[PDB]
């Protein structure tokens, strides 16, 4: 099994780097995190912050999730994020990604006891 909360960290957390290191970053991380095992996950975002920092977002600004549910929260501060979007030459099993670093507010769905992030919703 893999808890909702550990799957979030596996898919979205990357505190070991402060930014998108190189153009190689996405191809490497997407595969590394097993995001390219059943298909090429089209898009994925990695947050370069500490796990305490991202968890604290569950107590920040409450906003509507893209799905209409209401358990989403927006971060008061912008965080360092790396955006990975699948290219055109990307053909499974050879998935390809364009790495894109930025600093934006993250929106995450939170749930549970403790109330921890379980889904990345967006960034603005």
UniProtKB/Swiss-Prot annotation:
Its EC number is 4.6.1.18. Disulfide bonds join 26-84, 40-95, 58-110, 65-72. Interacts with and forms tight 1:1 complexes with RNH1. Dimerization of two such complexes may occur. Interaction with RNH1 inhibits this protein. Monomer. Endonuclease that catalyzes the cleavage of RNA on the 3' side of pyrimidine nucleotides. Acts on single-stranded and double-stranded RNA. The gene is RNASE1. Pancreas. The chain holds residues 27 to 150 of 150 of the full protein. Its main location: secreted. Belongs to the pancreatic ribonuclease family. Keywords: Disulfide bond, Endonuclease, Glycation, Glycoprotein, Hydrolase, Lyase, Nuclease, Secreted, Signal. The lineage of its organism: Eukaryota, Metazoa, Chordata, Craniata, Vertebrata. This is Ribonuclease pancreatic. GO terms for cellular component: extracellular region. Substrate binds at residues 7, 10, 41-45, 66, 85. It catalyses: an [RNA] containing cytidine + H2O = an [RNA]-3'-cytidine-3'-phosphate + a 5'-hydroxy-ribonucleotide-3'-[RNA]; an [RNA] containing uridine + H2O = an [RNA]-3'-uridine-3'-phosphate + a 5'-hydroxy-ribonucleotide-3'-[RNA]. Glycans are attached at residues 1, 7, 34, 37, 41.
